[PDB]
C-alpha cells in the first residue's frame, strides 16, 4: 500500500476510538511481516500525539508500550522510538506546543527525555511556549530528585536487584553519577563501602563504573583505606581493578 497506510492510520487515530483503531490494523495491516507495514506501524505513537485525542494515546500506551502482556497483534511499541528525523513522540508533542501530552509522556516509567534527534536536540528544545518548557524542566528536576533518593535507599538496604534496575534505565545513565561525593562527607560510594569492608558490594560497584582513582576530600583514594582475610580481599580487589584502567593509558 506504501504511504496510504500512513493515511489509513492517521485517519484511524484522528477519529478517536481505540477499538476502531484496532479494527483498522486488524483488517488492513496484513501482512504484518512485510517491512512496509512494520515501518508505518512503529510510527503510531508519533502519529497519535499529532492528531489523536488524549484518551486514545493513553489506551495505546497502557496496551502496547514497554509491556510483555502478549498485547494484541503482537505489537510492541517503544516509547522513545526515533523518527526518520530522529525525533521521539515526546519531541513532536513538545514541538507542537501540545502541553497536556508532554505531561503524560514524562510521567511514564520508561520515558527517556534526554534523547538526541538528528539535529542534536533534546525534546525540551523543540517547543515554543515557555510555559511548556518550564513544566518539562521542572519534571526532570523532580525525577532526578526522586531517583537519587531511591539510589541512596538501595545502597543503604544493599538492595542489589534495585541498583541494577536503576542503572539499566538509560534516562538514569544520563542523569545520575555513581561517583559523586556525598556533599557533607568525603565520599564516593566506593569509599563508603570500602570502609564497611563490604567486599560483595565493592565488587558490584567496580563493575558499574565507580573508578578506583577518585580521592575523597582527604587525598586518600580507596586502596588507602586498609579475621583480616577480608581486608586482603579488598586490597587485592582494587589492585586488579586499577591495573585495568592503566591499560587504556597506553603511553
Amino acid at each position: 500500500s506504501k504511504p496510504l497506510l500512513k493515511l489509513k492510520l492517521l485517519d484511524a487515530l484522528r477519529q478517536g476510538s481505540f477499538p476502531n483503531l484496532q479494527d483498522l490494523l486488524k483488517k488492513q495491516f496484513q501482512p504484518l511481516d512485510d517491512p512496509n507495514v512494520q515501518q508505518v506501524l512503529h510510527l503510531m505513537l508519533h502519529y497519535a500525539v499529532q492528531v489523536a485525542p488524549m484518551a486514545v494515546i493513553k489506551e495505546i500506551v497502557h496496551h502496547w508500550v514497554s509491556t510483555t502482556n502478549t498485547t494484541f497483534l503482537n505489537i510492541h511499541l517503544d516509547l522513545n522510538e526515533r523518527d526518520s528525523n530522529g525525533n521521539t513522540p515526546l519531541h513532536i508533542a513538545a514541538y507542537q506546543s501540545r502541553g497536556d501530552i508532554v505531561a503524560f509522556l514524562l510521567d511514564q516509567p520508561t520515558i527517556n527525555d534526554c534523547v538526541l534527534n538528528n539535529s542534536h536536540l533534546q525534546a525540551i528544545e523543540m517547543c515554543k511556549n515557555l510555559n511548556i518548557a518550564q513544566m518539562m524542566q521542572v519534571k526532570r528536576s523532580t525525577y532526578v530528585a526522586e531517583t537519587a533518593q531511591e539510589f541512596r535507599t538501595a545502597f543503604n538496604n544493599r538492595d542489589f536487584g534495585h541498583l541494577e534496575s536503576i542503572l539499566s534505565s538509560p534516562r538514569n545513565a544520563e542523569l545520575l553519577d555513581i561517583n559523586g561525593m556525598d556533599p557533607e562527607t568525603g565520599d564516593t560510594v566506593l569509599h563508603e563501602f570500602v570502609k564497611k569492608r563490604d567486599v560483595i558490594m565493592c565488587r558490584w560497584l567496580l563493575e558499574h563504573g565507580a573508578d578506583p582513582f577518585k580521592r575523597d576530600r582527604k587525598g586518600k583514594l580507596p586502596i588507602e583505606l586498609v579475621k583480616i582475610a577480608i581486608d586482603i580481599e579488598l586490597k587485592k580487589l582494587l589492585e586488579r581493578a586499577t591495573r585495568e584502567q592503566s591499560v587504556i593509558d597506553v603511553t
Binding site: L176, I178, M181, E184
Partner: peptide, 16 residues
C-alpha cells in the same frame, strides 16, 4: 546539618 536527607542524595548522585 545544612542539607536534609533527600536533597543530600540529589547533590551526591545528581549530575547537574
Amino acid at each position: 546539618k545544612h542539607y536534609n536527607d533527600g536533597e543530600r542524595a540529589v547533590l551526591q548522585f545528581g549530575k547537574n
